[PDB]
Amino acid sequence: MYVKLISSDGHEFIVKREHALTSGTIKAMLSNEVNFREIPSHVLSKVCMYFTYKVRYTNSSTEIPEFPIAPEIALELLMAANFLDC
């Protein structure tokens, strides 16, 4: 089962449902599609990568890589992460 997350500029990101439920905010908005009128696609894409990163590396004994954040998107990513509580 997949879910769709639409950015402010209309980009459609399709992610595994379980991955998106990392966000309690997104969980509440689903209870299969969600619109984010304040989060542009260059932020929402990085949010989706974080879901994959978190699901993959949580409780793993392997070496954990840094999660890269370009400085140009750092401020916008912070507010998205703050609103989504993940």
Binding site: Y50, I64, F67, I69, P71, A74, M79, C86
Partner: protein
């Protein structure tokens, strides 16, 4: 409360830094005070000498970001069976995206220019509330 026990029983440990951070090893003394020790460059391992029942935590040496050791917050050396040293695998935790974003922003903006950032007031206080070993110990103890 959280403190090393004065066991006087030697225990040799391998500090393995599997993180891209410069790691600051912090030993909690018998009074529970954090005591900093020599730093470890990224990707380096060292055999050190400690004691059974001692408490250790691991931090970013430059920013004080918390790190994990054997997938948890605190490390206690145990008995060296067959003389083999205990392995302490120092890794990055999976930070929340918010804390990870706070880290990048702190590394780019001096704390003085924070209140000049265009964000909610809660984020101004979030940035200024730098990782603090004493605070984290009080949180764990609570």
């Amino acid at each position: 409360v959280l403190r090393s026990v004065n066991s006087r029983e030697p225990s040799q440990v391998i500090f393995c830094n599997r993180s891209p951070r410069v790691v600051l090893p912090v030993w909690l003394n018998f009074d529970g005070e954090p005591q900093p020790y020599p730093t470890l460059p990224p990707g380096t391992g060292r055999r050190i000498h400690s004691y059974r029942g001692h408490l250790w935590l691991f931090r970013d040496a430059g920013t004080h970001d918390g790190l994990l050791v054997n997938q948890t917050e605190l490390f206690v050396p145990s008995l060296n069976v067959d003389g083999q040293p205990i392995f302490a695998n120092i890794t990055l935790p999976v930070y929340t995206l918010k804390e990870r974003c706070l880290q990048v922003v702190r590394s780019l903006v001096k704390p003085e220019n924070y209140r000049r950032l265009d964000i909610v007031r809660s984020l101004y206080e979030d940035l200024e509330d730098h990782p603090n070993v004493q605070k984290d110990l009080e949180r764990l103890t609570q």
